[PDB]
Amino acid sequence: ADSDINIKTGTTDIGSNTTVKTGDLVTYDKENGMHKKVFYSFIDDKNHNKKLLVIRTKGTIAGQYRVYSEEGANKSGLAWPSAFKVQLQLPDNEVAQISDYYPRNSIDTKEYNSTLTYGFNGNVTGDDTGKIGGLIGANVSIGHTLKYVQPDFKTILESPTDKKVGWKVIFNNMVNQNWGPYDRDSWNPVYGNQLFMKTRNGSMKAADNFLDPNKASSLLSSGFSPDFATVITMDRKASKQQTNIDVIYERVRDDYQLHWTSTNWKGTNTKDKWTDRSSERYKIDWEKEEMTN
Amino acid sequence: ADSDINIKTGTTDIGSNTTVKTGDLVTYDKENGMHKKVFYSFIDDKNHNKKLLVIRTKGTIAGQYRVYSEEGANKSGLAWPSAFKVQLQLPDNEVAQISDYYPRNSIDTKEYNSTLTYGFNGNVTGDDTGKIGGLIGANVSIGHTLKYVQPDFKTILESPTDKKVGWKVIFNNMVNQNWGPYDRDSWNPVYGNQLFMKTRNGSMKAADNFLDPNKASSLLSSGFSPDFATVITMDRKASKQQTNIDVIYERVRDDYQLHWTSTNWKGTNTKDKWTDRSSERYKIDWEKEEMTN
Amino acid sequence: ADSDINIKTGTTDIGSNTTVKTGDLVTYDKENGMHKKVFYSFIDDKNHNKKLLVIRTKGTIAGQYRVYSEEGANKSGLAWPSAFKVQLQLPDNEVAQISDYYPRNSIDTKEYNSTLTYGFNGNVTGDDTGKIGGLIGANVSIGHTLKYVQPDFKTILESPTDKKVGWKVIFNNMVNQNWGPYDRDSWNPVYGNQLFMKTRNGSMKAADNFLDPNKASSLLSSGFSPDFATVITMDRKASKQQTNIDVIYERVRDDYQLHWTSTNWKGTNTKDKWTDRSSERYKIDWEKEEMTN
Amino acid sequence: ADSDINIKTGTTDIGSNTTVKTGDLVTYDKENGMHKKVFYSFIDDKNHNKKLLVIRTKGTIAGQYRVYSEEGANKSGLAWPSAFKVQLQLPDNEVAQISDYYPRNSIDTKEYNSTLTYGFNGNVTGDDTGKIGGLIGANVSIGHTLKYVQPDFKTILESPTDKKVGWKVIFNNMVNQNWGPYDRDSWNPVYGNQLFMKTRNGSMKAADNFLDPNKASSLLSSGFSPDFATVITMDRKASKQQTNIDVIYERVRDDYQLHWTSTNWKGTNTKDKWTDRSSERYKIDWEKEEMTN
Amino acid sequence: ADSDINIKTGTTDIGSNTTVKTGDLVTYDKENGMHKKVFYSFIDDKNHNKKLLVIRTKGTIAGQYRVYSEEGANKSGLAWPSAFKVQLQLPDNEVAQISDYYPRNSIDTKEYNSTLTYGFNGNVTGDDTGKIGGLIGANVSIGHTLKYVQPDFKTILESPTDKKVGWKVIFNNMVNQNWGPYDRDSWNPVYGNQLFMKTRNGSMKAADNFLDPNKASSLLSSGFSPDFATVITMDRKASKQQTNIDVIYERVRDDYQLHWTSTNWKGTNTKDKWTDRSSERYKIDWEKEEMTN
Amino acid sequence: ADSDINIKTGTTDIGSNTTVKTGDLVTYDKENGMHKKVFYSFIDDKNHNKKLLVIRTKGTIAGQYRVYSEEGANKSGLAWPSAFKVQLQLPDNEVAQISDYYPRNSIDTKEYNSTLTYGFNGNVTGDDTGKIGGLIGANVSIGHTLKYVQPDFKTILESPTDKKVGWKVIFNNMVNQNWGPYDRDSWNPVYGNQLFMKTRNGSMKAADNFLDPNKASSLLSSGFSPDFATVITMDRKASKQQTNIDVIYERVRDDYQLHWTSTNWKGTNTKDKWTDRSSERYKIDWEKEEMTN
């Protein structure tokens, strides 16, 4: 931080004494169930070597967790969001560049606990007949406990370039009615993957044996609201002061199936079964400082 | 945050050098027990590409946790709030759009603790006769603890569009006199769902064997106070500068019933038995910058 | 801090009453998969004995965790990032100096828990044949629990001089599907190093038995985004007011090999097998207060 | 705090309505591997009874943790930093005085847990022959658990006078691959001091059996970056308005030796074997309000 | 807090619209190893009923933990700081008064954990000879855990008057190499007081069996830095506008003696064997707003 | 909070654009060992319906923990502060009123931990003779833990009226050398009340068997510093613009006595044995805006 290097806070930040032009662009993709919103800001700071555009991709991608197929009371399928994605990309011959973005990938940590114990204990025994007994024994215990936090979904910054940047919020793991956690690869020789299995031996129809969406991650059903920012820089002398940028909102769905084995329920999960992609092109005009779609 | 992208804090925010028109609108629905209040704010920032309206839905929906039926003395039913809802909807022909909203769904997390342990120990017997014994043993343990928070109610942002947005505060689970927690599906073969059961074997009538509201989540009785914000954008060039919007407050009630088996109490819960819907039409005038109902 | 020595906050900071000249310079290295971005700030504060240039090295170095080789189906290798580095170097004939930098090395801590516990107990047994027999016993135990946090990667400031400075974010240790944590030297006689081993006895081919990137540190694949700052001072009277500086972005990759032993999977790790070095020269003009490349 | 004594916050602080003159002085000692940087600030506040100079000593002292000796494959020695020092000294004739400094020594704390627990347990036995048995026993136990944090290195303000002040960052203790923690006096009859011992009885050479620096405190190798402030005051009537002051950066290295005993590795540590002392004289001109070396 | 009584924050503080006169006075007492610094501030706020002088007593009192006594290879003495004191005193004739001071005494707390646990447990036996066994027992446990923090030294505000005020930072207790903690009265029938004992029975001179100062509170050695504030009020109409005040920095040292008992080390601690007192008279001129010594 | 009700923060606070008159009044009662200080602030905000006076009662009441009687080595009594009090009272005929005060009584809380655990365990014995048996058992355990903080002294706001308000800082309970905690009612059939007993069976003068004041709450000896505020309102039309108000500082002391039984020490505590009351009248002049005594 500036203070660590003996500099007045904010001194090197950009935007002071600059008339900032902002804008909101909302698009709703009915078929893909995605509310796409771009909030932009043109920052042409004259003490900065380039014009800047801050593009904030927000809105929300519906989870769309749902029973899609019910082919018999013994077999049913559930489609669910295993990944949400937002991507911005500048066409190959664009002189403008991707300069920054937030959030980014943070280093995860884990707490380690190592414990060593050992003790002693005696024991004088006896009975009515008169037998006087005794005992002496030692003991040693060594063990460790590993602690770490696991978000239901991971927010990851995809390897960016000067033309493209993106984030993917992927299903990590989840607790099912206090059990697990389970993930996309969880497997029980008897029950298979119990990720969204409501009951193991219940008697209802397969289509009714899936976990209640309210008892699972809210992102699965109601959806995820992106809140990403990317800064694009542009040379004032660049010959073409108009830039095109394509934005992808995406949802990757897995297929979780339940079938009755005549004795109990067994679940299966198939990865990236479906993919819903909504693309939108925005036009950036660095002279009028406006962004449209 | 702006700091992470080397930009002066608040540089890209909307509002500066703008006269903002605010307003308050209160409506009490007696039949539905809802105090409905709209706090609005027009922000027509000329450096922003569109007119903006921030609508904050507040007030409070009474819980109405009450004993409604009493078929005799050994059976009675309790009406309780399993969900509170607030929705705003723009008629499909409006050019104005829902651009943002808050709160949104946040990713839940859980803490995982893995523990491994190994031990050694010796034992040396004894007794008056002069018999000396021995003992050498080992042990291994591989247990793990899972930790997470469980709010009595979850605040969920429903999948929005550019015309409709809503929230639902749904009952999640609750503690009943230190036991449980219990939820809408809890089931014991003997006592059924004990969600709001005061006693297991009391000799009182059914109507008097429901948990005292003061010992349950206060939202169940006194109520929930929404505090949601919806942002609506409007083209300044739009021919029609008036917009209609409907705001709906709802309460979904479950039916928790108790009956005497002959030896103990047994409860059952019927989901979404009743639904109290309170809708209201508001007029938004982007030119006068006022909202009326 | 200033307040700790009775001095008004901010009093000794640099930057006040100074027009700061900032700039952004972006470079993408396709071959090495590195998005390199320099954010600089020239601070020529006249109450300071020197001109300053704050150089923030950001961008993102792709992790590139991937299977690079596979011989048959029982042998395969995985290239992964064990180190990410950023270095700045001023030529020996330069009069400009490296004055500060951030972050720096933090002093690690650990928590200690010492446990001592005494205990005694009485006992009395008996049978139908009226046999009375008591038991008196005692016990002690010394325990020690050690606690500390372990980041997946450590961020380290390398020993700087007045002409060179660098940082290295190195792989420390990582949790593999709840087990471990494992590091570059972990070794088990039967399984070898299980760092990125998916299964111990799986029947799939080697290339398919590597931990899924989504289930490992996000730096390994998507990558690491540097956020380091370098401060360079320049004498206003130096004959030469132009400085060249070389910035280097690197990725050191280890080679994690898996092979079937006819009975189970066994892995090995080879350190620093590959090094991707991306260097670029920038020109610093202290007079025009601009940096170019 | 000032609010505790009903005084407007910052009212007694120094620096308002004063032009502060600052400066940076960087020196790199190659022989001792020390990047030395002085950041000074002259505050001649006229409502203060004396002139003020704040000298911040920063830069970085390399750790220099390295294998220095190799006599065969059974013996080897490691040089490592047990202390990093920074000292400032005014020659005794100077009228100027050291008035303040930061950081200082803080009172350390510890947590105490007393656990008294009572216990009662009975029993009933009955073999398949009609024989009955009983058991009644009690138990008591008093446990104590001590908790406190131990930084790898302690940052200490040495006893100052009005002519000299200094800090010493000394090696405290450190975890070795989850064991320990070990310190400079750690001793085991078998392995001796295992402080930096990689393996107890590995087959490699002595020079290859030292802990990976990356697995040890980063200060040991990469180095320590001082961040100390010294405040010096000066009478305005002082006849002589120039002051000399020496600044010494120091590193004390221990000698850690490992030798093969023919059955297992044994470690030995020799304290303060080497001292690297880098001294430099600066000139303080209270009139020109500048510092020079 | 002002906001708690509906008053704008700071509305009540003293000092606004007032030119404050500050000063620094440094005195080094070599024989007593005390860096004594007074930082004062005169606040003559015309809207306040009296003149204010805020005296801050800082600097640092050297710890001086040392093996000063050596009476052969079986006897040695360590002199250590059991208390540090700072006192300010106005003569009985003075009209100026002590009005406020900081820090003050804070109410300590303790955490209480009351645990009650009980349980049952079945058990069936059976040898390959047809003999079946049974077992049924229960248990009850009642135990409490007391938790609290123990600073090495306690900072205490002595009972002030309108003429004198003072502080004392007294040794509380301390952890000795993972054991204890020990205080000034710790007594063991075999080892006596092990406060600063390094080994129970190591074979070395008595002068070498004392705890390394680096392994004990740094206040014992390097020293304590007072940071106490005293506010003295003066009536603007008082005949004499000059006040004398005596400031005393003091150190009380205990004597920790070690001696071999033919088999082990035994320790004793003598309280307040030495009291190092450093007093200095200062002159306060309320008309000139100057403090001198 | 103002923000919670959509109002600009601080918008409703009192004191803006108002000249505030403040003052200090110091009184030392040697007989009662009480430093009494009043810090007042007249706030006559013309946009507020009444004149306002903020009276801050501070200073400090000496604890006075002391051995007062010694009737032979087997008997001795200790006087200690079981309560400290501060009260302000306006004679009944005053039109001025006590409007607010701080601190107030806050709702205490506790943490509840209910643990449910059940398990199974198999076994198989054996003897070189050829016998092969086994033991199968189960177990259950319901245990709960209660957590809460217990300050040594409780700061309580006494029931106020519009003519009188007061606080009491009463002794709650205290840890005695890691045992207890003890309070005024603690009673042991063998030792009686051990609140301040140094040793249970110590062979020394009774007057020397009281706990060292440094090992007990510092309020007991050095004392408590009141830091209370009282706001008084006054009608501007009131015909009499002078108000009298008495401030009482008080200390209540218990009597803790230790007598040798013959085999051990036994303590006894007599509640509210003594009461030291220091009263003083102040004159409030709402026109001159000053407080005098």
Ligand SMILES: OC[C@H]1O[C@@H]2O[C@H]3[C@H](O)[C@@H](O)[C@@H](O[C@H]4[C@H](O)[C@@H](O)[C@@H](O[C@H]5[C@H](O)[C@@H](O)[C@@H](O[C@H]6[C@H](O)[C@@H](O)[C@@H](O[C@H]7[C@H](O)[C@@H](O)[C@@H](O[C@H]8[C@H](O)[C@@H](O)[C@@H](O[C@H]1[C@H](O)[C@H]2O)O[C@@H]8CO)O[C@@H]7CO)O[C@@H]6CO)O[C@@H]5CO)O[C@@H]4CO)O[C@@H]3CO
């Ligand atoms: O009996 C003394 C103890 O009693 C009280 O504790 C009760 C507690 O307040 C209740 O909430 C409940 O606890 C349950 C807990 O809430 C559950 O989460 C679970 O616990 C698991 C842990 O979550 C999990 O991480 C792992 O735990 C391991 C630790 O992570 C690891 O650090 C180590 O623990 C050692 C401690 O580090 C060390 O300090 C020392 O602990 C002593 C305490 O510091 C001391 O205060 C006192 O504890 C009181 C406690 O304060 C009361 O509130 O004595 C302790 C001595 O043991 O030693 C620890 C042991 O080595 O190891 C642990 C175990 O591997 O696993 C656990 C489950 O095993 O379950 C809990 C039910 O036990 O009940 C407790 C007890 O009544």
